[PDB]
Amino acid sequence: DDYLQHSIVPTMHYQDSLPRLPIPKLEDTMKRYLNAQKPLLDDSQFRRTEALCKNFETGVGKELHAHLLAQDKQNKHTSYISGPWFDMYLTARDSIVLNFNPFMAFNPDPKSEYNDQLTRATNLTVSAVRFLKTLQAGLLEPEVFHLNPSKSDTDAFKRLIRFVPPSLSWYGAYLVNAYPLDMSQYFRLFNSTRIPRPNRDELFTDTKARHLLVLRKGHFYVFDVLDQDGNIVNPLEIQAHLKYILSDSSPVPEFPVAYLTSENRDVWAELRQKLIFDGNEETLKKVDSAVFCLCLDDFPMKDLIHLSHTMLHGDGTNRWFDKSFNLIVAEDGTAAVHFEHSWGDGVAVLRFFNEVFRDSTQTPAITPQSQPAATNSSASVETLSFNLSGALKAGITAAKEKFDTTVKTLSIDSIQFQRGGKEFLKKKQLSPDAVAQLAFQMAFLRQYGQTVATYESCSTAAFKHGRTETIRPASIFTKRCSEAFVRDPSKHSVGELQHMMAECSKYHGQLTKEAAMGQGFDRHLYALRYLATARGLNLPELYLDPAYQQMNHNILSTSTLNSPAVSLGGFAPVVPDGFGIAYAVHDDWIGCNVSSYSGRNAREFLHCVQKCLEDIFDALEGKAIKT
Ligand SMILES: CCCCCCCCCCCCCCCC(=O)N[C@H](CC(=O)[O-])C[N+](C)(C)C
Ligand SMILES: CCCCCCCCO[C@@H]1O[C@H](CO)[C@@H](O)[C@H](O)[C@H]1O
Known part of the structure; x- marks a missing residue:
């Protein structure tokens, strides 16, 4: 079936x-906030922040917290942060490219010849549509x-x-x-997109749509992947329609419309209204409502850096960035899921990603020797046509100029630390996750001589409408241990260094357990600020503290996923002078794929990460550290 x-x-x-997502006690939230400020603030700064926290806890904060609790109990169908968090994404006016949209790339099919572009694009598409049917049937576990x-x-x-x-x-x-876990996001996996609007963008779904959207060389094509009865279209016909698109000889359009989805959201909001004015609404609705966007790139991957740029942003012409996700398949069969972040989270995208990898590799719809159906693709595949005014063409040229300028500033690179991973670290009674995080702290100290605001995503999907909470890895313990290794390694015995690492690991484990239970401080302080603002009040003084701003300017932004389907993943930094650190600890090795803009140096950071991991593993093996 x-x-x-x-x-x-x-x-x-x-x-x-x-x-329901727990709301911490305000006394806990303030303590945790201060604990995380301790490594970042000088004594005088910390004392100022401490005084602000005291007044907040007994003053306007107490009152906002009472209101937050009252509101949550009138809205038991959701979480206190769900509305604010959808707002954080949807009110954002900056480009969704780099700022928000991540990617995860698939490992190859273990069978060499199944990585043929046509073959794999067909198989991945069919599996994704099988996933859709399985979800809709209530048959997905x-x-x-x-x-x-x-x-x-x-x-x-x-x-x-x-x-x-x-x-x-x-x-x-x-x-x-x-x-x-919560699965409410699955309703936006398919047939869904983000529409630019003034003030706040809109999440659109049309579950009635039966068609796929395909981008090749900036041209837009649509064809049905579900028949009128709800059955999946013959995979040989799908193969034929994909071959038809791969065979098309038209050059890239003068004005590739897809550039527009990378614009500032107000600019794109205006230009989309103008497209509608010019009679493009029916065409736009075909784009908006497609099951997903399949992107067929006509070049192989040169290396992992090329792969990362390709899947994170591409050249501007061949991704519909607004779509719930884009499924990208390169000329060498290298595939990835690039997704729009407002509707979804790693956990949900990974489930889809994992089931599609399994199904497309273990029960592929077609083989590399399958013969495409003799089907009238000229009729069955519609090549969309937009009516572009002079203003739209100027808009597309300006969209490309902005896109090209930003992409130029972006660097990405990776390391694969082969000496050890989960297996070794678990034997040393350490958290593998804590160890990677310690390495990033230690590497940043070695490269820049600073301790900076650090963010690690953690899923709160155990709760109704739960998305994420922030783990704060930069602790008193990591600062102490990084100082020992980096600035005075001769001053500590191997046993003392090991103790410092045990402590780091314990504390990280504690932060992780708490964040997963909704007991971080970030979302709660976020909601209190949002509530003041929504009720029309002046920003409380706690939020005007430069320390609050600094805490939320995440120089080290990190996230990890664990899957045998994942080759690598990535995201751009969240601030101009940041790193975007995607990592995974495997049984035998640790990988990091790190992005940066011009103001940081990802290549040097990764050299520092490698050295720190060497030092960490040396100390754990009782070896005196190499200096
Ligand atoms: C060569 C080895 C490289 C392996 C990389 C492992 C893959 C990790 C991919 C993670 C990409 C992001 C996936 C989930 C999205 C996510 O974590 N969003 C975060 C969402 C949040 O609310 O924190 C935002 N941010 C990425 C900025 C921290
Ligand atoms: C066969 C599966 C066993 C189901 C056990 C049902 C337990 C649910 O009992 C629950 O207890 C909670 C605490 O008193 C309350 O918050 C809920 O209102 C109540 O429904």
């Missing part, structure tokens, strides 16, 4: 009974974190839990140490 899974537990079985898959991720448990009503289901899982 057209399904990639056959869950007996309905996909959405736990949704109704998910726990619910997303569940298991503390022990051996006990709870079993047919025995599945057999019973399917009889527990959704009002009670979450508790059945909880009782077996299993934690169903």
Whole structure:
């Protein structure tokens, strides 16, 4: 059948009974805030910030917190941060490219010849559409974190839990140490896009649409991938339609319309209204409503740097950046998912990504020797046509100029530390994640001699409408340990360094456990500020503190995903003088793919990361450190 899974537990079985996102006690939030400021602030700065926190906790902060709690109890169907967080993305006026949109790239199909572009584009497309059908049938297994898959991720448990009503289901899982996650975002995976508007962009879905959108050389093509009965279109016909697009001989358009999706959101909002004025709404709706956007690039990947640039931004002509996601397939079959961030999070995109990798590699729809159907693709595939005014053409030229200028400022590079990973570190009773994070702290100290604002994403999807909380890796412990290794390594014994690392790891583990339970401080302080602003009040003095601004200017922005389907991933820095650090700790090795703008140096940072990882592993093996 057209399904990639056959869950007996309905996909959405736990949704109704998910726990609500906790609101921390304000006293906890202020303590945690200060704990994270301790490594960043001089004594005088910290004392000023400390006084502000005291007045906030007993003053206007107490009052905003009471209101936040009252509001949350009138809105038990959601989380206190969901509205504010959708706003953070959707009110943002800057380009979604680089600032927000990440990518994850697939490993190759293990079978060499299945990496043919036509073959793999067909197979990946069909798997993605199989995913859509599986979700819609309620046949996709619910997303569940298991503390022990051996006990709870079993047919025995599945057999019973399917009889527990959704009002009670979450508790059945909880009782077996299993934690169903929110899946509300899955409704925006397909047939969905972000529409530029004044003030705040709009999330559009049209679940009735049956067509795929394909970009090749900046030309837009659409064809049905679901028939009138809801069945997947013959994969041989899909293959034929993709071959038809690959065969087209038209050069890149004079004014590639896709550039517009990389613009400032007010500029793009105006230009889209003008497209509508000029009679393009029907065409735009075909773009907006397609199941997803498939992008066919006509060049192979030169190396991982080329891959990163290609999947993170491309050349401006061949990505519809607004779409829920773009599935990119290069000439050498290298594929990736590039996604718009407002609707979704790593956890949900990864589930899709993982199921599509599994299905396209283990049960490919077509082979490299399949013969395309003899189908009238000239009729079945529509090449979209936009009516562009003089203003639209000027807009596209200005969109390209801005795009090209920004991309020029961006560098990306990677390391693959081969000496060890999870296996070695777990044997040393350390958190692998903490160790990578320590390395980044230590590397930044070695390169720049500073301790800076650092962000690590953590999923709160265990809660209703949960997205993320911020882990703050830059701690008193990491600062102390980085100082020891970098500035006075002769001053500490190998045992003392090991203790310093144990402490780092413990504290990181504590921060991680807390953030996952909604017990970070960032989202809570964020919501309180949002609430003051929404109620028409002046910004509280806590938020005018330069220390608050500095804490939220994340020079080191980090995120990790763990998957055998992932070759690499990436995102640009979140501030001009930042690094965007995508990393993974594997059993045997640690990879980082780091982005930077002109004001930082990613190549030097990565050389520093490598050295720090060498020092860390040396000390853990009891070897005196190489200086
Ligand atoms: C050569 C080895 C390289 C391996 C890289 C591992 C892949 C990691 C890819 C992560 C890309 C981002 C995926 C999820 C998006 C995400 O984490 N968004 C974060 C969302 C949030 O709310 O924190 C934002 N930010 C990236 C800026 C921290
Ligand atoms: C077979 C699966 C076992 C289901 C056990 C149901 C337990 C749900 O009981 C729950 O207890 C909570 C604390 O008192 C309350 O917040 C909820 O209102 C209540 O429904």
